[PDB]
TrEMBL record:
Cross-referenced InterPro entries: CRASP-2-like (IPR054523)
Zinc in keyword set: yes
Binding site for Mg(2+): 98, 101, 109, 112
Protein name: Complement regulator-acquiring surface protein 2 (CRASP-2)
Keywords in alphabetical order: Metal-binding, Plasmid, Signal, Zinc
Keyword Zinc: yes
Record-linked Pfam families: CRASP-2 (PF22487)
Gene, per the UniProt record: cspZ
Residues bound to Zn(2+): 47
Sample GO molecular function, one term: metal ion binding
Species, as recorded: Borreliella burgdorferi (strain ATCC 35210 / DSM 4680 / CIP 102532 / B31) (Borrelia burgdorferi)
Length: 217
């Protein structure tokens, strides 16, 4: 008759991912807070060696010490491992290699550390969206699948504006939907309000399709 058995399998798969990934944004925030000074010091004091070399060495030490930062990224990778097997792995290797090679003094290497980090930060955000993209694409409900495409696009446009703020919104919003908490569609922001609201509008549309499925189960 109907496809309730299938729709329930889809809700189940989405709910598992979201609950398993619920600390993803907090974990990226902890990387950002530890590394932001070190990133900016590399960008500043490597733009021209004149020199602050001691500052650059110390900045590199924050990214390298006890492989802590690399392992924090691997912890995020392990969260999305089931879903996007090779998304992040190359970019984590690239960073690891730059860190391995940065035995100073070498600004280019120091700038390569900073760029490989920034690129990896943005990938960790896209990885979450890509996982939801793969999950949503297994939905038998065509209205949900259409609403999911619109969400991923607005999600990605939001990432371009600010990767950590975008990831925080995506995680909280998807979280609200699978826990049946009504999504607020308004941004109260002073920075990035336009793109946040575009993203929140696509999430209200998705919440609509999600509820329409849920109400038949």
């Amino acid at each position: 008759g109907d496809v309730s058995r299938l729709n329930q399998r889809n809700i189940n798969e989405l709910k598992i991912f979201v609950e398993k990934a619920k600390y993803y944004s907090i974990k990226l925030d902890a990387i950002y807070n530890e590394c932001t000074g070190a990133y900016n010091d590399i960008m500043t004091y490597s733009e021209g060696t004149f020199s602050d070399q001691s500052k650059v060495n110390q900045a590199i030490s924050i990214f390298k010490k006890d492989n802590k930062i690399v392992n924090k990224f691997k912890e995020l990778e392990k969260i999305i491992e089931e879903y996007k097997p090779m998304f992040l792995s190359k970019l984590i290797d690239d960073f690891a290699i730059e860190l391995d090679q940065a035995v100073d003094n070498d600004v280019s290497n120091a700038r390569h550390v900073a760029d490989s980090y920034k690129k990896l930060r943005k990938s960790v955000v896209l990885a979450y969206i890509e996982s939801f993209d793969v999950i949503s694409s297994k939905f038998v409900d065509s209205k949900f699948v259409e609403a999911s495409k619109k969400f991923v696009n607005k999600a990605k446009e939001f990432v371009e504006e600010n990767d950590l703020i975008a990831l925080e919104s995506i995680v909280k919003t998807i979280g609200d939907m699978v826990n049946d908490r009504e999504i607020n569609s308004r941004s109260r922001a002073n920075n990035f309000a336009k793109k946040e609201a575009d993203f929140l509008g696509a999430a209200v549309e998705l919440e609509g399709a999600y509820k329409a499925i849920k109400q038949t189960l």
